């Protein structure tokens, strides 16, 4: 048969952060604050905040992301793709904010689609460490234990 790649899959994560949606939304856009919880960033635009259809490399250039669509403190859509992945593979992260004023927290519903079947646990095991725990430790958005 012909040589090719495999199909894709999708995962769902729901981390809870002790921070309002006004500050958590700026965490994923402020380049000076993105470099804090990532320790490695490569922005190609001189703008201070991320814009639509703006590409940027993270973690020594291995993580390529691009902001496609975003609403004011409510929606965040990124075109996440790993450098180890092949050319046709490309994923899309859909972040939805579920801030609850009763407990003073925000549960960021993340609907991640487009990841390969062989990497659905790789990008998930690193998300709770490079995206969830890294923000909760650098900015202190909740106790880590």
């Amino acid at each position: 048969p012909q040589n090719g790649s495999g199909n894709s899959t999708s995962i769902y994560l729901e981390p809870t952060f002790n921070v309002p949606s006004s500050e958590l939304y700026e965490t994923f856009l402020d380049k000076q604050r993105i470099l804090a919880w990532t320790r490695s960033a490569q922005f190609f635009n001189s703008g201070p905040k991320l814009e639509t259809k703006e590409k940027f490399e993270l973690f020594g250039g291995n993580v390529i992301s691009e902001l496609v669509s975003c609403e004011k403190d409510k929606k965040l859509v990124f075109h996440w793709k790993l450098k180890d992945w092949s050319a046709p593979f490309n994923s899309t992260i859909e972040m939805t904010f579920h801030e609850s004023q009763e407990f003073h927290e925000t549960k960021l519903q993340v609907k991640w689609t487009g990841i390969p079947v062989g990497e659905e646990d790789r990008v998930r095991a690193n998300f709770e460490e490079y995206y969830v725990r890294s923000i909760k430790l650098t900015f202190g958005f909740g106790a880590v234990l």
Partner: protein, 606 residues
């Protein structure tokens, strides 16, 4: 086509069963005791129908005789024995278990529960011995010798040189030249106290005159009902399964029946070190490294778990991956949750349990999400209405007035620092009880719980609002705009040290204090995060009813908002209130220098 039956290479299968099955080589004593225990159960099952089977050897025991001068480790029992055919069919055939056939031939409903069910455990003795000289004797046959050296064949000869035994089997093991450690006294007791400690039959050991010492004095308590077991018997059982020198604080002995039948005797120690749960199948220790059996936060309890339906490994050193683990894991937590409630029913016994395992109860509220509400009822803390005795969260909501809708608490480094905190005078005036949190792990549990019986957990160190009358709010809002030039003046002085300076009416006596920002780490949490060996926004608030702040109000009216002399006080008052709220003091030398200047003024020196 042609049909062929499966075959086995005997010369190569023997090397696999012996060398490449068991991780350790000391388990050979465990299996030979298990084989002796099964033989004693066979002759005992026949004794219930015929008492004459025990006339030859009345006592049922397992004797171990080490011989250092002869390099021989004898293991003698008084079981049913093996006839001439059993030494060839049962003992001479790999994977042939005569014990398994005995359990299937007896009547349905027998009380006996034998151990051997595979048929390859006997060959484990060759890991430490080159040649074996098993001697057998049955009531319906003569005495024979089963000699083999783990080779391709074995030899069975009529015994005409050894002593005439009544009934049982004598296993003479000629240990290897590099396995002579099993001839000592301590090494034999170490293996028995690890794998064959709770054998139903006495295990005798010949130690140097010559005497016989029993190595299994302590009998298993999971074979008896909890109604006929005394308290002292649980103490000796706990001091035997664990090396602890103290009696257990509480014992939970339960038994689950139905689809899954297993018994467990869980003990609660009297202190904490700052796995423990053993597994027993067929009265034989299997393993104690199953961390999935019991949660990590609940791993302070000890005890054993007895079961008979577990799919044990061929080596019997562990068990296969199965869905039964989470079923036993659920029943262990369910019974220990109820076990903690039985201790909560008492006052003096729960004082020792909470003072010794305060961390474990609070870790379950942080980690576990299913029993978080059940563990919240076990928490005990101090409060403004309970200074000496520890109060619970259930007793807290009983004393809450009709208008109070939240549970207030406070964290800090010590109890003396929070009992006189400047944040209590506001709630004590409104008769609102405030809990006291003095351990670093308290805030980690109150951050996950966030609610108890519908009441929201509110930290008074963080920013929060209290309800008040509409007439009182109209009088406070008009007072804030009067202090508006003063609040904005203190912002330019402190700069970025605080987010903002606002008037606060939750401070009566204290001149000023620094709050948090309703989000992130509090004043005490950041102190804990920066103190872990292996591992936010603040708001400055002033009290408008204090003579110090009232004196600062007239200073900015005369044009002293940017005055040099007032900066020495407002910066000292800010860093002083940081110590009362629990924040870290940056550059303590500059704080002490400004204090030394005021001490010099008190001593009339420049």
């Amino acid at each position: 086509g042609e049909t062929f039956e499966f075959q086995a290479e005997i010369t190569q299968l023997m090397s696999l069963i012996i060398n490449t099955v068991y991780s350790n080589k000391e388990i050979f004593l465990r299996e030979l005791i298990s084989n002796a225990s099964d033989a004693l159960d066979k002759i005992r099952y026949q004794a219930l129908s015929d008492p004459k089977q025990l006339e030859t050897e009345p006592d049922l025991f397992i004797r171990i005789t080490p011989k250092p001068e002869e390099k021989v480790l004898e293991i003698r029992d008084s079981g049913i024995g093996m006839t001439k055919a059993e030494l060839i069919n049962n003992l001479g055939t790999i994977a042939k278990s005569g014990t398994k056939a005995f359990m299937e031939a007896l009547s349905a409903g027998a009380d006996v529960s034998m151990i051997g069910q595979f048929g390859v455990g006997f060959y484990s003795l060759f890991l430490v011995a080159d040649r074996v000289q098993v001697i057998s004797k049955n009531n319906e046959d003569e005495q024979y010798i089963w000699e083999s050296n783990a080779g391709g064949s074995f030899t069975v000869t009529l015994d005409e040189v050894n002593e005439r035994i009544g009934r049982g089997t004598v296993l003479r093991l000629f240990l290897k030249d590099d396995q002579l450690e099993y001839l000592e006294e301590k090494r034999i007791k170490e293996v028995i106290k690890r794998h064959s400690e709770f054998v139903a039959y006495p295990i005798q050991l010949l130690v140097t005159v010559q005497e016989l010492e029993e190595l299994n004095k302590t009998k298993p308590l999971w074979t008896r009902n909890p109604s006929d077991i005394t308290q002292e018997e649980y103490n000796a059982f706990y001091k035997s399964i664990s090396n602890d020198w103290e009696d257990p604080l509480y014992v939970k002995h339960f038994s689950v029946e139905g689809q899954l039948e297993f018994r467990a005797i869980l003990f609660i120690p009297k202190r904490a070190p700052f796995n423990n749960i053993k597994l027993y199948v067929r009265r034989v220790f299997i393993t104690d490294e199953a961390e999935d059996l019991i949660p990590e936060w609940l791993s302070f309890v000890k005890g054993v778990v007895d079961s008979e339906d577990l799919p044990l490994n061929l080596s019997r050193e562990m068990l296969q991956q199965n869905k039964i683990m989470k079923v036993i894991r659920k029943n262990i937590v369910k019974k220990l949750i109820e076990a903690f409630n039985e201790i909560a029913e008492d006052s003096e016994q729960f004082d020792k349990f909470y003072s010794a395992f305060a961390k474990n109860i609070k870790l379950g509220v942080h980690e576990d999400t299913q029993n978080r509400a059940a563990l919240a009822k076990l928490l005990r803390y101090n409060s403004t209405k309970s200074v000496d005795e520890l109060t619970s969260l259930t007793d807290y909501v009983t004393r809450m007035p009709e208008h109070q809708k939240n549970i207030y608490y406070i964290t800090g480094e010590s109890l003396k620092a929070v009992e006189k905190s400047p944040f209590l005078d506001a709630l004590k005036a409104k008769n609102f009880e405030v809990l006291f949190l003095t351990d670093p792990i308290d805030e980690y549990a109150f951050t996950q719980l966030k609610e108890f019986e519908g009441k929201t957990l509110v930290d008074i160190t963080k920013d929060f609002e209290l309800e008040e009358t509409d007439e009182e709010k109209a009088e406070r809002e008009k007072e804030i705009k009067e202090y508006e030039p003063l609040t904005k003046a203190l912002k330019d002085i402190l700069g970025d040290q605080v987010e903002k300076v606002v008037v606060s009416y939750k401070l009566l006596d204290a001149p000023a204090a620094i709050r948090t920002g309703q989000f992130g780490w509090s004043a005490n949490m950041e102190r804990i995060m920066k103190a872990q060996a292996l591992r936010s926004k603040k708001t400055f608030e002033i009290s408008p009813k204090s003579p110090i702040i009232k004196e600062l109000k007239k200073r900015v009216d005369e044009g002293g908002a940017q005055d040099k002399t007032v900066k020495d006080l407002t910066n000292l008052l800010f860093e002083t209130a940081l110590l009362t709220s629990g924040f870290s003091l940056e550059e303590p030398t500059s704080f002490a220098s400004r204090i030394n200047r005021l001490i010099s003024l008190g001593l009339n020196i420049d």
